[PDB]
Amino acid sequence: EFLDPSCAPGGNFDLSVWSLQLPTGSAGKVDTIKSRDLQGCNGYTGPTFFTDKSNGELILTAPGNPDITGCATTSGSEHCRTELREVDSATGQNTDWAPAGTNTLTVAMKVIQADDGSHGTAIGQVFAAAASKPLAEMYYSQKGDITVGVKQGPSGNQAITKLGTVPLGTYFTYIMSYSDDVLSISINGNKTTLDTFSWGTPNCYFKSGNYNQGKTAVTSEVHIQSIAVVHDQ
Ligand SMILES: *[C@@H]1O[C@H](CO)[C@@H](O)[C@H](O)[C@H]1NC(C)=O
């Protein structure tokens, strides 16, 4: 369970359940690293996704407002990211799951610099594949306030709930759960059950990393110490 400073992230974390979306791109489409290329001690590394040479942890950076920085955005988004997108462990293909049974994402993270978006940097998501929209988008502000925006059904705006406060530079553990049709997030074991409004049990998938919401060019920086996905149906 010791991370290896000499390995790429694929040697220190199970990246067989992830692909990586980057803030660079070509043809207005962002570069994506397939799971097969992330995996292993000799897997992908780049300028925004690399191993901390002091301790083996994962460092993810992302640039601010693309209108200023020129960074690449996914379709439908106006913000740049270095962010992991869940895939099927067997095939490497994009996946999603029903919120029946148990679906959790547990991450130990610290934020070194957050962006100046309304709520700060997005550090985890439950994405509703069924509506091509986020169900829950968790944010970390420059004051260390952790919040979540939950769309009021697929056509509604995000309702914001405060989840906790953690000072910048301090490690914390989050758990995002959408299980037995109940959405909840815990921060250091403090659990908040969240209203899902008019959402009709959408198929979803997890995202985790650094999705920079900045109004200005401010960079964001996230470090990850552990990341685990559980599906038990
Ligand atoms: C969890 O709740 C306790 C008790 O209200 C509080 O002292 C602590 O700051 C909370 N944790 C976070 C990360 O906000």
mmCIF file of C-alpha atoms and ligand atoms in Angstrom:
data_model
loop_
_atom_site.group_PDB
_atom_site.id
_atom_site.type_symbol
_atom_site.label_atom_id
_atom_site.label_comp_id
_atom_site.label_asym_id
_atom_site.label_seq_id
_atom_site.Cartn_x
_atom_site.Cartn_y
_atom_site.Cartn_z
ATOM 1 C CA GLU A 1 0.000 0.000 0.000
ATOM 2 C CA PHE A 2 3.035 2.243 -0.354
ATOM 3 C CA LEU A 3 3.030 4.486 -3.393
ATOM 4 C CA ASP A 4 6.173 4.438 -5.548
ATOM 5 C CA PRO A 5 7.655 7.854 -6.453
ATOM 6 C CA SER A 6 9.393 6.268 -9.467
ATOM 7 C CA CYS A 7 6.151 5.029 -11.096
ATOM 8 C CA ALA A 8 3.625 6.820 -13.268
ATOM 9 C CA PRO A 9 0.176 7.126 -11.673
ATOM 10 C CA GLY A 10 -0.878 3.832 -13.324
ATOM 11 C CA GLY A 11 1.554 1.972 -11.056
ATOM 12 C CA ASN A 12 0.217 3.558 -7.879
ATOM 13 C CA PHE A 13 -3.554 3.635 -8.521
ATOM 14 C CA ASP A 14 -5.995 1.252 -10.196
ATOM 15 C CA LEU A 15 -6.555 3.103 -13.471
ATOM 16 C CA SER A 16 -8.251 0.121 -15.136
ATOM 17 C CA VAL A 17 -11.569 1.816 -14.252
ATOM 18 C CA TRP A 18 -10.593 5.264 -15.573
ATOM 19 C CA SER A 19 -9.833 7.186 -18.736
ATOM 20 C CA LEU A 20 -8.312 10.690 -18.597
ATOM 21 C CA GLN A 21 -9.661 13.934 -20.103
ATOM 22 C CA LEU A 22 -7.032 16.653 -20.606
ATOM 23 C CA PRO A 23 -6.976 20.434 -21.118
ATOM 24 C CA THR A 24 -5.211 20.103 -24.475
ATOM 25 C CA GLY A 25 -6.887 19.076 -27.687
ATOM 26 C CA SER A 26 -7.192 19.210 -31.442
ATOM 27 C CA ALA A 27 -10.214 20.079 -33.598
ATOM 28 C CA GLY A 28 -12.041 21.589 -30.617
ATOM 29 C CA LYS A 29 -12.113 18.094 -29.060
ATOM 30 C CA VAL A 30 -10.098 17.362 -25.949
ATOM 31 C CA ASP A 31 -7.316 14.784 -25.823
ATOM 32 C CA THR A 32 -8.403 11.645 -23.984
ATOM 33 C CA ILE A 33 -5.987 9.005 -22.654
ATOM 34 C CA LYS A 34 -7.486 5.506 -22.814
ATOM 35 C CA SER A 35 -7.383 3.292 -19.735
ATOM 36 C CA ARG A 36 -4.996 0.868 -21.482
ATOM 37 C CA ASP A 37 -2.487 3.732 -21.862
ATOM 38 C CA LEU A 38 -2.930 5.010 -18.291
ATOM 39 C CA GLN A 39 -2.312 1.638 -16.663
ATOM 40 C CA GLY A 40 0.976 0.485 -15.217
ATOM 41 C CA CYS A 41 4.133 1.913 -13.699
ATOM 42 C CA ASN A 42 5.177 2.930 -17.239
ATOM 43 C CA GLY A 43 1.768 4.380 -18.119
ATOM 44 C CA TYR A 44 0.893 7.879 -19.256
ATOM 45 C CA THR A 45 2.292 10.982 -17.628
ATOM 46 C CA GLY A 46 2.086 14.552 -18.834
ATOM 47 C CA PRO A 47 2.484 18.174 -17.769
ATOM 48 C CA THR A 48 -0.871 18.251 -15.909
ATOM 49 C CA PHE A 49 -1.023 14.613 -14.670
ATOM 50 C CA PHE A 50 2.092 13.241 -13.002
ATOM 51 C CA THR A 51 3.579 11.580 -9.922
ATOM 52 C CA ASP A 52 4.842 13.573 -6.932
ATOM 53 C CA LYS A 53 8.499 12.528 -6.839
ATOM 54 C CA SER A 54 8.663 12.909 -3.043
ATOM 55 C CA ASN A 55 5.870 10.473 -2.159
ATOM 56 C CA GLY A 56 4.205 8.811 -5.178
ATOM 57 C CA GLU A 57 0.917 10.748 -4.977
ATOM 58 C CA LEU A 58 -0.962 11.922 -8.074
ATOM 59 C CA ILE A 59 -0.766 15.625 -9.027
ATOM 60 C CA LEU A 60 -3.465 17.066 -11.339
ATOM 61 C CA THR A 61 -3.330 20.668 -12.566
ATOM 62 C CA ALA A 62 -5.700 22.551 -14.821
ATOM 63 C CA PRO A 63 -5.806 26.020 -16.402
ATOM 64 C CA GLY A 64 -8.459 28.684 -15.925
ATOM 65 C CA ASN A 65 -10.964 30.387 -18.241
ATOM 66 C CA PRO A 66 -10.467 29.004 -21.784
ATOM 67 C CA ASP A 67 -11.445 32.370 -23.236
ATOM 68 C CA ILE A 68 -8.179 33.622 -21.685
ATOM 69 C CA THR A 69 -5.939 30.546 -21.615
ATOM 70 C CA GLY A 70 -6.863 28.861 -24.898
ATOM 71 C CA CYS A 71 -7.266 25.473 -23.210
ATOM 72 C CA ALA A 72 -9.498 22.833 -24.826
ATOM 73 C CA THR A 73 -13.021 22.068 -23.581
ATOM 74 C CA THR A 74 -15.335 19.093 -24.030
ATOM 75 C CA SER A 75 -18.577 19.483 -25.951
ATOM 76 C CA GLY A 76 -21.143 21.317 -23.874
ATOM 77 C CA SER A 77 -18.570 22.671 -21.394
ATOM 78 C CA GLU A 78 -16.951 26.107 -21.066
ATOM 79 C CA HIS A 79 -14.261 24.947 -18.589
ATOM 80 C CA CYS A 80 -10.986 23.003 -18.881
ATOM 81 C CA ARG A 81 -10.056 19.873 -16.944
ATOM 82 C CA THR A 82 -7.529 17.215 -16.023
ATOM 83 C CA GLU A 83 -10.178 14.746 -14.893
ATOM 84 C CA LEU A 84 -10.695 10.972 -14.742
ATOM 85 C CA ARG A 85 -13.837 9.579 -16.406
ATOM 86 C CA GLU A 86 -15.103 6.152 -15.353
ATOM 87 C CA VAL A 87 -14.758 3.182 -17.754
ATOM 88 C CA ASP A 88 -15.521 -0.537 -17.638
ATOM 89 C CA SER A 89 -12.653 -2.477 -16.064
ATOM 90 C CA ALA A 90 -12.892 -5.376 -18.524
ATOM 91 C CA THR A 91 -13.190 -3.495 -21.835
ATOM 92 C CA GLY A 92 -11.877 0.039 -21.238
ATOM 93 C CA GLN A 93 -15.042 1.439 -22.815
ATOM 94 C CA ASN A 94 -17.096 4.294 -21.400
ATOM 95 C CA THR A 95 -19.602 2.933 -18.907
ATOM 96 C CA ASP A 96 -22.497 3.866 -16.670
ATOM 97 C CA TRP A 97 -24.560 2.208 -13.960
ATOM 98 C CA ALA A 98 -27.957 2.182 -12.306
ATOM 99 C CA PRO A 99 -28.155 3.727 -8.843
ATOM 100 C CA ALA A 100 -29.747 0.552 -7.507
ATOM 101 C CA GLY A 101 -27.424 -1.374 -5.308
ATOM 102 C CA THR A 102 -24.146 0.133 -4.185
ATOM 103 C CA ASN A 103 -22.088 2.659 -6.144
ATOM 104 C CA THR A 104 -19.391 4.649 -4.335
ATOM 105 C CA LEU A 105 -16.330 6.757 -5.136
ATOM 106 C CA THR A 106 -13.871 7.239 -2.255
ATOM 107 C CA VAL A 107 -10.988 9.697 -2.720
ATOM 108 C CA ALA A 108 -8.331 11.049 -0.362
ATOM 109 C CA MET A 109 -7.391 14.484 -1.791
ATOM 110 C CA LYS A 110 -5.799 17.808 -0.903
ATOM 111 C CA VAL A 111 -6.205 21.065 -2.799
ATOM 112 C CA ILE A 112 -3.104 23.250 -3.160
ATOM 113 C CA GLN A 113 -4.719 26.001 -5.264
ATOM 114 C CA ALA A 114 -8.400 26.462 -6.122
ATOM 115 C CA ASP A 115 -9.908 28.551 -8.909
ATOM 116 C CA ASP A 116 -12.161 31.623 -8.724
ATOM 117 C CA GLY A 117 -15.335 30.090 -10.129
ATOM 118 C CA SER A 118 -18.491 30.756 -8.154
ATOM 119 C CA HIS A 119 -17.829 27.747 -5.898
ATOM 120 C CA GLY A 120 -14.220 26.955 -6.841
ATOM 121 C CA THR A 121 -12.777 23.852 -8.458
ATOM 122 C CA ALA A 122 -14.885 20.776 -9.267
ATOM 123 C CA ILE A 123 -13.199 17.787 -7.600
ATOM 124 C CA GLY A 124 -15.728 14.987 -8.163
ATOM 125 C CA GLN A 125 -18.914 14.296 -10.090
ATOM 126 C CA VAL A 126 -21.815 11.934 -10.483
ATOM 127 C CA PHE A 127 -22.647 12.449 -14.178
ATOM 128 C CA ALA A 128 -26.107 11.515 -15.516
ATOM 129 C CA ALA A 129 -25.428 9.682 -18.786
ATOM 130 C CA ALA A 130 -29.198 9.417 -19.341
ATOM 131 C CA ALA A 131 -29.522 13.217 -19.790
ATOM 132 C CA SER A 132 -25.924 14.044 -20.826
ATOM 133 C CA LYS A 133 -25.725 16.416 -17.775
ATOM 134 C CA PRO A 134 -24.219 16.325 -14.265
ATOM 135 C CA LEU A 135 -26.384 14.964 -11.454
ATOM 136 C CA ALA A 136 -23.965 16.204 -8.752
ATOM 137 C CA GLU A 137 -20.853 18.371 -9.108
ATOM 138 C CA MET A 138 -18.732 18.824 -5.956
ATOM 139 C CA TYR A 139 -16.721 22.040 -5.588
ATOM 140 C CA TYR A 140 -13.843 23.215 -3.363
ATOM 141 C CA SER A 141 -13.475 26.980 -2.886
ATOM 142 C CA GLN A 142 -10.491 29.237 -2.235
ATOM 143 C CA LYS A 143 -11.774 29.427 1.375
ATOM 144 C CA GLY A 144 -11.751 25.637 1.694
ATOM 145 C CA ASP A 145 -15.547 25.395 1.600
ATOM 146 C CA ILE A 146 -16.742 22.136 0.038
ATOM 147 C CA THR A 147 -20.132 22.310 -1.653
ATOM 148 C CA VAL A 148 -22.178 20.303 -4.132
ATOM 149 C CA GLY A 149 -24.426 21.491 -6.943
ATOM 150 C CA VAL A 150 -27.313 19.149 -7.741
ATOM 151 C CA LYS A 151 -29.375 19.948 -10.815
ATOM 152 C CA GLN A 152 -33.102 20.159 -10.047
ATOM 153 C CA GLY A 153 -33.831 17.396 -12.525
ATOM 154 C CA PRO A 154 -32.370 17.387 -16.021
ATOM 155 C CA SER A 155 -33.786 20.811 -16.937
ATOM 156 C CA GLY A 156 -33.188 22.609 -13.634
ATOM 157 C CA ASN A 157 -30.471 24.775 -12.182
ATOM 158 C CA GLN A 158 -28.031 23.529 -9.547
ATOM 159 C CA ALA A 159 -29.127 23.689 -5.931
ATOM 160 C CA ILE A 160 -26.041 24.223 -3.753
ATOM 161 C CA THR A 161 -25.513 22.384 -0.450
ATOM 162 C CA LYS A 162 -22.571 23.006 1.902
ATOM 163 C CA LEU A 163 -20.753 19.796 2.888
ATOM 164 C CA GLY A 164 -17.826 20.913 5.036
ATOM 165 C CA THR A 165 -14.751 23.103 5.262
ATOM 166 C CA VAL A 166 -11.141 21.931 4.938
ATOM 167 C CA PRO A 167 -8.150 24.335 4.861
ATOM 168 C CA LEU A 168 -6.165 24.407 1.636
ATOM 169 C CA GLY A 169 -3.214 22.054 1.749
ATOM 170 C CA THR A 170 -4.870 19.581 4.151
ATOM 171 C CA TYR A 171 -5.816 16.049 3.100
ATOM 172 C CA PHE A 172 -9.463 15.008 3.447
ATOM 173 C CA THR A 173 -11.509 11.990 2.339
ATOM 174 C CA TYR A 174 -14.653 12.275 0.274
ATOM 175 C CA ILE A 175 -17.203 9.557 -0.521
ATOM 176 C CA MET A 176 -19.730 10.158 -3.305
ATOM 177 C CA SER A 177 -22.510 7.564 -3.139
ATOM 178 C CA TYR A 178 -25.543 6.990 -5.377
ATOM 179 C CA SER A 179 -26.825 3.769 -3.902
ATOM 180 C CA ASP A 180 -30.303 2.269 -3.502
ATOM 181 C CA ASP A 181 -31.485 5.424 -5.310
ATOM 182 C CA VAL A 182 -30.095 7.674 -2.531
ATOM 183 C CA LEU A 183 -27.495 10.361 -3.314
ATOM 184 C CA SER A 184 -25.107 11.292 -0.503
ATOM 185 C CA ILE A 185 -21.629 12.724 0.016
ATOM 186 C CA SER A 186 -19.409 12.368 3.069
ATOM 187 C CA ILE A 187 -16.420 14.534 3.951
ATOM 188 C CA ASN A 188 -14.201 12.957 6.640
ATOM 189 C CA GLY A 189 -17.168 10.815 7.682
ATOM 190 C CA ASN A 190 -19.685 13.694 7.922
ATOM 191 C CA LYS A 191 -22.467 12.444 5.624
ATOM 192 C CA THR A 192 -25.040 14.656 3.897
ATOM 193 C CA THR A 193 -27.991 13.043 2.125
ATOM 194 C CA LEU A 194 -28.935 15.097 -0.938
ATOM 195 C CA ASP A 195 -32.268 15.793 -2.617
ATOM 196 C CA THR A 196 -32.387 14.552 -6.231
ATOM 197 C CA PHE A 197 -35.565 16.545 -7.047
ATOM 198 C CA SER A 198 -37.281 15.354 -10.285
ATOM 199 C CA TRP A 199 -34.436 13.117 -11.502
ATOM 200 C CA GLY A 200 -35.811 9.753 -12.572
ATOM 201 C CA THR A 201 -33.126 7.205 -11.477
ATOM 202 C CA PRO A 202 -30.718 8.086 -14.312
ATOM 203 C CA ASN A 203 -27.853 5.856 -15.355
ATOM 204 C CA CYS A 204 -24.705 7.601 -14.122
ATOM 205 C CA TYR A 205 -20.918 7.431 -13.985
ATOM 206 C CA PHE A 206 -18.206 8.882 -11.778
ATOM 207 C CA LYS A 207 -15.616 11.568 -12.554
ATOM 208 C CA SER A 208 -12.762 12.619 -10.260
ATOM 209 C CA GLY A 209 -9.896 15.075 -10.500
ATOM 210 C CA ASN A 210 -9.517 18.749 -11.371
ATOM 211 C CA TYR A 211 -12.258 20.480 -13.404
ATOM 212 C CA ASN A 212 -11.294 24.158 -13.245
ATOM 213 C CA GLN A 213 -14.256 26.580 -13.073
ATOM 214 C CA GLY A 214 -12.164 29.742 -13.109
ATOM 215 C CA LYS A 215 -13.512 33.118 -14.203
ATOM 216 C CA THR A 216 -9.911 34.300 -14.672
ATOM 217 C CA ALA A 217 -6.846 32.358 -15.841
ATOM 218 C CA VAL A 218 -6.036 31.112 -12.290
ATOM 219 C CA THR A 219 -4.570 27.589 -12.267
ATOM 220 C CA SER A 220 -5.904 24.855 -9.988
ATOM 221 C CA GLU A 221 -3.852 22.081 -8.364
ATOM 222 C CA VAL A 222 -5.139 18.902 -6.695
ATOM 223 C CA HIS A 223 -3.193 15.995 -5.184
ATOM 224 C CA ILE A 224 -4.707 12.511 -4.828
ATOM 225 C CA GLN A 225 -3.483 9.904 -2.317
ATOM 226 C CA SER A 226 -6.088 7.162 -2.947
ATOM 227 C CA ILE A 227 -9.050 6.558 -5.265
ATOM 228 C CA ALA A 228 -11.460 3.582 -5.138
ATOM 229 C CA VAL A 229 -14.646 2.747 -7.035
ATOM 230 C CA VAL A 230 -17.133 0.186 -5.677
ATOM 231 C CA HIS A 231 -20.101 -1.275 -7.562
ATOM 232 C CA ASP A 232 -22.112 -4.006 -5.825
ATOM 233 C CA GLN A 233 -25.523 -4.654 -7.345
HETATM 234 C C1 LIG B 1 -17.625 17.406 10.613
HETATM 235 O O1 LIG B 1 -18.547 17.750 11.644
HETATM 236 C C2 LIG B 1 -17.917 18.212 12.847
HETATM 237 C C3 LIG B 1 -19.016 18.425 13.862
HETATM 238 O O2 LIG B 1 -19.998 19.335 13.386
HETATM 239 C C4 LIG B 1 -17.117 19.479 12.561
HETATM 240 O O3 LIG B 1 -16.433 19.867 13.746
HETATM 241 C C5 LIG B 1 -16.116 19.236 11.438
HETATM 242 O O4 LIG B 1 -15.475 20.460 11.091
HETATM 243 C C6 LIG B 1 -16.814 18.644 10.212
HETATM 244 N N1 LIG B 1 -15.841 18.314 9.182
HETATM 245 C C7 LIG B 1 -15.606 19.073 8.104
HETATM 246 C C8 LIG B 1 -14.560 18.559 7.165
HETATM 247 O O5 LIG B 1 -16.211 20.127 7.894
#
